[PDB]
Design a binder for these strands. Structure first.
Ligand SMILES: [Mg+2]
Ligand SMILES: [Mg+2]
Ligand SMILES: [Mg+2]
Ligand SMILES: [Mg+2]
Ligand SMILES: [Mg+2]
Ligand SMILES: [Mg+2]
Ligand SMILES: [Mg+2]
Ligand SMILES: [Mg+2]
Ligand SMILES: [Mg+2]
Ligand SMILES: [Mg+2]
Ligand SMILES: [Mg+2]
Ligand SMILES: [Mg+2]
Lengths: 67, 156, 129, 226, 70, 93, 88
RNA sequence: AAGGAGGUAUUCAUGUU
RNA sequence: GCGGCCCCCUGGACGAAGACUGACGCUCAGGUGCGAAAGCGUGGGGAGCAAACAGGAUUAGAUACCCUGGUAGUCCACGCCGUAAACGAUGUCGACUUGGAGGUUGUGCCCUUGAGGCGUGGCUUCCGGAGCUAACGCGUUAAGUCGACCGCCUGGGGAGUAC
């Protein structure tokens, strides 16, 4: 599966990059499991935080149906 | 020349679909009265068949004990499952002052003088195993000196 | 906390013999070296040495005769929680004399046999068989 | 007769199993690890092999029966050829639990095989129906695969040469029970406790087993020449 | 799971896509889990039991490849 | 004098290369119906399925002594048997 | 906790060079500063039992250090508990 | 709901979709 | 026991290299503090859920299970309470004794050739060897081998009850 953050040296995932985060949410808008994406556990936690911060700022939708 | 002794015969049961199947177990000890002793445990549907199986099994799987003039070399301790067994060399004339199973095994192994005392479960099967284990884990001055690289007089 | 370095040294010997190690090592002290010398002269260990200037390490090379370890049992007798002293008449006989009782007399640490001949009592460090 | 490091190394005796399967008791004979595979220290193999050869020679000179035990697919035919060509006995199919410790019952089966075999030569399997000539023939085939190498042994052997101490643990244990020394080629994943003459080395390559067997067969042959 | 009807796509084909989309979002499993309250102890017990048996079956399988059944 | 196993193995190791993914010369030791036993100088003689050699023409184009080339999978694989493969070497070149 | 600059000042005051951080006087002084600081926190946060457990460790450690110092050199101990304004 | 296949499961360009 | 995100105040753990103090340690009766849920007091708040309760069914009966409601309570603030299968049914501290597969969090090195290779720490799950275990098991995170100190046990019921 191979983590795409360990191989890029990324320190913090960043919630302002709405291209990487879109790859890590599903169509409904929920966060995809690390078991599927092959992300490491450390970057998974960072990634989940970034997605939640983006949702608050309405860069990402919470769900597919409130819009 | 091997003296033999049956210590215990005990009826067990299996409780098959039709009812209870009773069979017999025999505990025996054989020894040459000069430092070799073995025990045998045999099961069968009849008492003679059981004792026979036990005697044959006991004649095999015998071991050798380093006996000192009909007495022990030094105080020994034997332990098997829930049976502890203390044995001590005594002076000629005392006799074999031992318990129930220990009496048979010591008599047949050629110990004529000993002070023995069983601590713990006095189940004959485990008692026999513990006393034989104690007699086997007992060393003489010759082997102790050889192990330590000394002479017997050096060890005294 | 470590509160009985003598028992620790006996424990290392016991565990090393049970695990068939060639030699065991421990931090050194003069009491440990004295006990080690008695063991070596009684033939329970093959050799000992001390290496190190500021933090000496005492190394003992263990002995096996027929595959089996030479020291059959070794137990601390006097311990910090309960000290044992014996008068010259009351010295023990480990294994009817076939073992040694390391006794720390006023003339140094020696075996029970040596102290009994020298007419001394003292503290009983350990039993060795 | 005599082997050397180059011959052992050409046949692949130094190779062992992979590290995660080893036996800590087998550590002394381990040289190193290369690409997650243990390497067997031939400096230990050579003197041990020569010492085992000397003991095997002494037994052969005293007219001791040698039982060649090897049952893996990589050493079945190898062990059969070595024991035929050294005038000794072998087992190269599934070892029967109790071959040695239950020799009395196993011996009755030996007698059955001999009678069945002589009957086949005589022609007894003609009077009976065709089915009774295939059943008995099938019985003879099975008895040959199992006890065809020890039908003439006639007693408990004096030594076992087991190719795989791991695979043939039952045979080694019966030997230890009875009193029979064991000479065993022991890999890195095996237990050398029940073996009396350990010979570290790869036991899965056909080249290596042929190496060991040729040397052992020559030693026994020369010891019986005497 | 919001499925838009594609061009020329028959109804059966679109319906299969929609059913699989819902099964991928796991809606029905979620609803069945929220029908009734379960104590946190019950939830933890069930989670731990599934892990234990899943691990045991993986280990059992990975050892079944070792031996032959005939 | 003896070239101790250290130096001897130090030569051998660079003489036969054990990389999980490198093709090596392999001599067929035995032809069999559905399997082919090759030896590359390793822990064991691999049993390759024969259909990599009974070619698309249905011809067992090789026999004993043919220095074929095969892909090394593992010098030991679970059961002490080196794993080789011919169509892998085929596909690489 | 205690800032980098605050620790540096205290080490200079109570240690006999900038590199003397392990002295009993310096350790007691650092512990005392942090203990005094946390009083305001626990005045506003009476329900912070977890942080208060950390504080009790500090108080306990200061007593052990002062006991050692009193038994080891009484004059330094009197001088220290006078500067730091500590009873007993 | 029933069966089959693959795994302890994915790398499998993106794009298209 | 702790689960959205953000801020403020704050506790502990670990790693790297180095400097400093110089036995300052371990355990701990009594004592002190923390301590699920239910409950209690005072005042809030009350969507959902829900003892008690009310009704409807089921049943030979049904003071239950099932259904429709529904109060205290569950939430907050401040005080009580001090207890649980508060369990790893395994007291704390230290030392020693074969291995394997993982997780998680640091760090060093090598060619990072591209998620690689090679080491070294902390915590953690599962197998397991010797040894221990009535046995089950346990096993370097012991229930092996040892030492320090504290807590407890002495047939079952009466009874964790009476006074
Ligand atoms: Mg009793
Ligand atoms: Mg108390
Ligand atoms: Mg409450
Ligand atoms: Mg209230
Ligand atoms: Mg109220
Ligand atoms: Mg209701
Ligand atoms: Mg209680
Ligand atoms: Mg709990
Ligand atoms: Mg629990
Ligand atoms: Mg309790
Ligand atoms: Mg286990
Ligand atoms: Mg009461």
């Amino acid at each position: 599966k191979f983590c795409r953050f360990t191989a890029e040296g990324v320190q913090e995932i960043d919630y302002k990059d709405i291209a990487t985060l879109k790859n890590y949410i599903t169509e409904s808008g929920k966060i995809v499991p690390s078991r599927i994406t092959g992300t490491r556990a450390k970057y998974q936690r960072q990634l989940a935080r970034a997605i939640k911060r983006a949702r608050y700022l309405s860069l990402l939708p919470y769900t597919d149906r409130h819009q | 020349e091997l003296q033999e002794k049956l210590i215990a015969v005990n009826r067990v049961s299996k409780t098959v679909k039709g009812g209870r199947i009773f069979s017999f177990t025999a505990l025996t000890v054989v020894g040459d009265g000069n430092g070799r002793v073995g025990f045998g445990y045999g099961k069968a549907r009849e008492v003679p068949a059981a004792i026979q199986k036990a005697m044959e099994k006991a004649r095999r799987n015998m071991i050798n004990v380093a006996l000192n003039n009909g007495t022990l070399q030094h105080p020994v301790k034997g332990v098997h499952t829930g049976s502890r067994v203390f044995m001590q060399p005594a002076s000629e004339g005392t006799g074999i002052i031992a318990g129930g199973a220990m009496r048979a095994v010591l008599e047949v192994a050629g110990v004529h003088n000993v002070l023995a005392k069983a601590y713990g479960s006095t189940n004959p099967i485990n008692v026999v195993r513990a006393t034989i284990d104690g007699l086997e884990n007992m060393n003489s001055p010759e082997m102790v000196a050889a192990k330590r690289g000394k002479s017997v007089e050096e060890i005294l | 906390s470590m509160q009985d370095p003598i028992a620790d040294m006996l424990t290392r010997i016991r565990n090393g013999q049970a695990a068939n190690k060639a030699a065991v090592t421990m931090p050194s002290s003069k009491l440990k070296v004295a006990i080690a010398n008695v063991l070596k002269e009684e033939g329970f260990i093959e050799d000992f040495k001390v290496e190190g200037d500021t933090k000496p390490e005492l190394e003992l090379t263990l002995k096996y005769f027929q595959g089996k370890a030479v020291v059959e049992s070794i137990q601390r007798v006097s311990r910090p929680g309960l000290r044992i002293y014996k008068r010259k008449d009351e010295l023990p006989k480990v294994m009817a004399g076939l073992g040694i009782a390391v006794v720390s007399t006023s003339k140094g640490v020696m075996t029970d046999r040596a102290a009994r001949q020298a007419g001394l009592g003292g503290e009983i460090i350990c039993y060795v068989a | 007769a005599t082997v050397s490091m180059r011959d052992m190394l050409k046949a692949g005796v130094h190779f062992g199993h992979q590290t995660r399967y080893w036996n800590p008791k087998m550590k002394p004979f381990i040289f190193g690890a290369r690409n997650k595979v243990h390497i067997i220290n031939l400096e230990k193999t050579v003197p041990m092999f020569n010492e085992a050869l000397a003991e095997l020679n002494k037994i052969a000179s005293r007219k001791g029966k040698i039982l060649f035990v090897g049952t893996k697919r990589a050493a079945s035919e190898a062990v059969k050829d070595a024991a035929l060509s050294c005038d000794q006995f072998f087992v190269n199919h599934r070892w029967l639990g109790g071959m040695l410790t239950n020799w009395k019952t196993v011996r009755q089966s030996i007698k059955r095989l001999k009678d069945l075999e002589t009957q086949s030569q005589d022609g007894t399997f003609d009077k009976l129906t065709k089915k009774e000539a295939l059943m008995r023939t099938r019985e003879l085939e099975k008895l040959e695969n199992s006890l065809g190498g020890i039908k003439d042994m006639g007693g408990l052997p004096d030594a076992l040469f087991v190719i795989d101490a791991d695979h043939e643990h039952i045979a080694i244990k019966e030997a230890n029970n009875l009193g029979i020394p064991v000479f065993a080629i022991v890999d890195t994943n095996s237990d050398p406790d029940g073996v009396d003459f350990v010979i570290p080395g790869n036991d899965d390559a056909i080249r290596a087993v042929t190496l060991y067997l040729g040397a052992v067969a020559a030693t026994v042959r020369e010891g019986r020449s005497q | 799971p919001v499925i838009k009807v594609r061009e020329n796509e028959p109804f059966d084909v679109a319906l299969r896509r929609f059913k699989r989309s819902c099964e991928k979002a796991g809606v029905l499993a979620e609803v069945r889990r929220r029908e009734f309250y379960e104590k946190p102890t019950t939830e933890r017990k069930r989670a731990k039991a599934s892990a234990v048996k899943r691990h045991a079956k993986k280990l059992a399988r990975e050892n079944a490849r070792r031996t032959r059944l005939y | 004098m003896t070239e101790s196993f250290a130096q001897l193995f130090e030569e051998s190791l660079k003489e036969i290369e054990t990389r999980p993914g490198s093709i090596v010369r392999g001599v067929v030791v035995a032809i069999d119906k559905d399997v082919v036993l090759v030896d590359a100088g390793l822990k064991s003689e691999s049993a390759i399925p024969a259909e990599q050699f009974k070619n698309a023409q249905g011809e067992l184009e090789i026999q004993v002594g043919d220095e074929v080339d095969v892909a090394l999978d593992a010098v030991e694989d679970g059961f002490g048997e080196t794993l080789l493969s011919r169509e892998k070497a085929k596909r690489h070149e | 906790s205690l800032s980098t600059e605050a620790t540096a000042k205290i080490v200079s005051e109570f240690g006999r060079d900038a590199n003397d951080t392990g002295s009993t006087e310096v350790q007691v002084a650092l512990l005392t500063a942090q203990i005094n600081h946390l009083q305001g926190h626990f005045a506003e946060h009476k329900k912070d039992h977890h942080s208060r457990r950390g504080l009790l460790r500090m108080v306990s450690q200061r007593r052990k250090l002062l006991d050692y110092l009193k038994r080891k050199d009484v004059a330094r101990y009197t001088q220290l508990i006078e500067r730091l304004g500590l009873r007993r």
